[PDB]
Amino acid sequence: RPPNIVLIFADDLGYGDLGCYGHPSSTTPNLDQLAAGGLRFTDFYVPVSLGTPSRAALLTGRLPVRMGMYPGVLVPSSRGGLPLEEVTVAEVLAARGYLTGMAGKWHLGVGPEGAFLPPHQGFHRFLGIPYSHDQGPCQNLTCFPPATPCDGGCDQGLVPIPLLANLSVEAQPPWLPGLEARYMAFAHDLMADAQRQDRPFFLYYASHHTHYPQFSGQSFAERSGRGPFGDSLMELDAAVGTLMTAIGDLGLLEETLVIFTADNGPETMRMSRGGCSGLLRCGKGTTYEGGVREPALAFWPGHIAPGVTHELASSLDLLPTLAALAGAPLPNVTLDGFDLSPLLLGTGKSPRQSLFFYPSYPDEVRGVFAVRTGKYKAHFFTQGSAHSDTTADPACHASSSLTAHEPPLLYDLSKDPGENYNLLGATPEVLQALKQLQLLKAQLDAAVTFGPSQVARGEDPALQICCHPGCTPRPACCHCP
């Protein structure tokens, strides 16, 4: 009965990059066709616009500050990770008899002997990199075949990037141009095996596209009309087409729910090798709309009618929506998301009315930075980010320091999705929204306790993964292509 679920999650992909979201030069045919036969969201969000906190909110349905996933992101030597008491979507579904698998980027911790890796958090199978593909030296890696080097060199002084098969190093570093093929092969096996055992599968595909540095296989190099950022987006798009064909071939089209979203806004610091937030303001690292609002598509033939919704939805609602769909019971913890099945099935409206946004570096004195309720969004604090540097808007830059706003900056997103015109710079409708927004912020700030910081547990270079354990000299000896 339960449907097969495929969750595709891109990296550093903006609201404005898909062809079907208006980009003028992107090449995204498979995703455009998924949009045309399914539900496209205009108002779907993540609560925090950084890699780690966003992946944690997705898998647990819980605001990242509750389990210490702040500040910033995790690094290869981090001691901390997503606590093992947290229940993930993979576990909710595993206990209901799903065969669960994950391909790609984890970024939720490695820890002493890989205690925080995926196999310990409900995934039966796992093929991927445990953090971002730029958190290790890349001046000698090939990003585009036959021999175009990755640009800029990535993070120095670390072990090369490891490709893992569950808990074992399969390659270090992997060959970037062939990663996609590896991941499609893995996905195909997971599907077929689940079919054979008469059980539903759950595929978590956490792509490295479109994070820096850009790369692709040889079928896409110089073929998109948007340079390296495009080639890489085009490969991600072809991966979606490949998964849809594999779902075709096995006669599972009407029994599989396919969801596509992305973790956080574009890193405009990469300039034309980085994403695009379209009409929205600023990008990764900020609580402006270009940082937190992402593309989101839902496709399930004969169940989800083709259309466009403007209803409020969050990555936080994915656990409870998927549980409900699979007839799995919810964990016994406070959750911050809701079941969106009525909306998906067209029998009801989204139950979500409000959204809460935390910054990259949160603190308990300040609390939530921005809150949206209906079409209104208030900003109590504003701050630019180096990840959103280089565009013409000065509020996006790292030089825009942390600034308090009281009364808050107040925008009507139905008319000013670009956050250009502060309404408080009077009306009874506005005043009532203002008072609601202020009370929602004070209620959440008083009820939420911050879990102890995982990131502040520190770093220990002995925690880096090494293909040749015991090796010397570290870290350059750790390798095995």
Ligand X SMILES: *[C@H]1O[C@H](CO)[C@@H](O[C@@H]2O[C@H](CO)[C@@H](O)[C@H](O)[C@H]2NC(C)=O)[C@H](O)[C@H]1NC(C)=O
Please report, as ranges, the residues that interact with its own copies according to CB under 8 A: 16, 19, 21-25, 36, 42-43, 225-227, 229-230, 271-272, 276, 278-279, 281, 308, 310, 375, 390-395, 412-418, 420-421
Q: List interacting residues with Mg ion (CB under 5 A).
A: 11-12, 51, 263-264
- Comparing CA positions, the residue from 203, 201, 211 lying closest to residue 161 is 211
Checking DSSP bridges between strand 256-262 and strand 4-10, what pairing results, if any? Answer: parallel
Number of residues that bind ligand X (CB under 6 A): 10
**CB-nearer residue toward Mg ion: 14 or 200:** 14
Query: H helices of 26-104, where?
Result: 29-36, 51-60, 89-94
Applying the rule CB under 6 A, the residues between 70 and 129 that interact with ligand X are: 99, 124-127
**CB-nearer residue toward ligand X: 105 or 377:** 105
Query: Residue 455 and residue 74: Cα distance in Å, rounded?
Result: 6
**CB-nearer residue toward ligand X: 201 or 212:** 201
Applying the rule CB under 6 A, the residues between 161 and 180 that interact with ligand X are: 165-166
CB of 328 to ligand X, least distance (A): 19
CB of 223 to its own copies, least distance (A): 12
- Comparing CA positions, the residue from 210, 225, 218 lying closest to residue 273 is 210
Query: Residue 130 and residue 114: Cα distance in Å, rounded?
Result: 10
For 313, residues 6+ apart whose C-beta sits below 8 A from its C-beta are: 41, 43, 44, 45, 296, 340, 343, 350, 352
Q: If contact means CB under 5 to 8 A according to the sort of partner, which of ligand X, its own copies, Mg ion, none does residue 193 touch?
A: ligand X
- Do 303 and 39 form a contact (C-beta atoms < 8 A)? no
- Do 10 and 26 form a contact (C-beta atoms < 8 A)? no
**CB-nearer residue toward its own copies: 122 or 274:** 274
Applying the rule CB under 6 A, the residues between 120 and 139 that interact with ligand X are: 124-127
**CB-nearer residue toward its own copies: 420 or 449:** 420
CB of 418 to Mg ion, least distance (A): 21
| Edge-to-edge strand ranges of the sheet holding 293-294 | 293-294, 44-45, 313-314
- Comparing CA positions, the residue from 341, 336, 311, 338 lying closest to residue 3 is 341
Cis-peptide, bond into residue 213, ω within 30° of zero: yes
CB of 2 to ligand X, least distance (A): 17
Query: Residue 223 and residue 234: Cα distance in Å, rounded?
Result: 9
CB of 355 to its own copies, least distance (A): 15
CB of 381 to Mg ion, least distance (A): 22
Binder of ligand X out of 45, 131, 183, 186 (CB under 6 A): 186
Applying the rule CB under 6 A, the residues between 189 and 208 that interact with ligand X are: 189, 193
Query: Residue 405 and residue 325: Cα distance in Å, rounded?
Result: 41
Q: Is residue 249 at the binding interface for ligand X, with CB under 6 A as the rule?
A: no
**CB-nearer residue toward its own copies: 151 or 416:** 416
**CB-nearer residue toward ligand X: 25 or 197:** 197
- Comparing CA positions, the residue from 37, 2, 19, 59 lying closest to residue 337 is 59
Q: If contact means CB under 5 to 8 A according to the sort of partner, which of ligand X, its own copies, Mg ion, none does residue 127 touch?
A: ligand X
In the chain, the amino acid numbered 340 is L
Q: If contact means CB under 5 to 8 A according to the sort of partner, which of Mg ion, ligand X, its own copies, none does residue 306 touch?
A: none
CB of 264 to ligand X, least distance (A): 27
**CB-nearer residue toward ligand X: 167 or 444:** 167
Which tokens sit at 282? 């600023």
Where on the chain is the footprint of ligand X (CB under 6 A)?
A: 99, 124-127, 165-166, 186, 189, 193
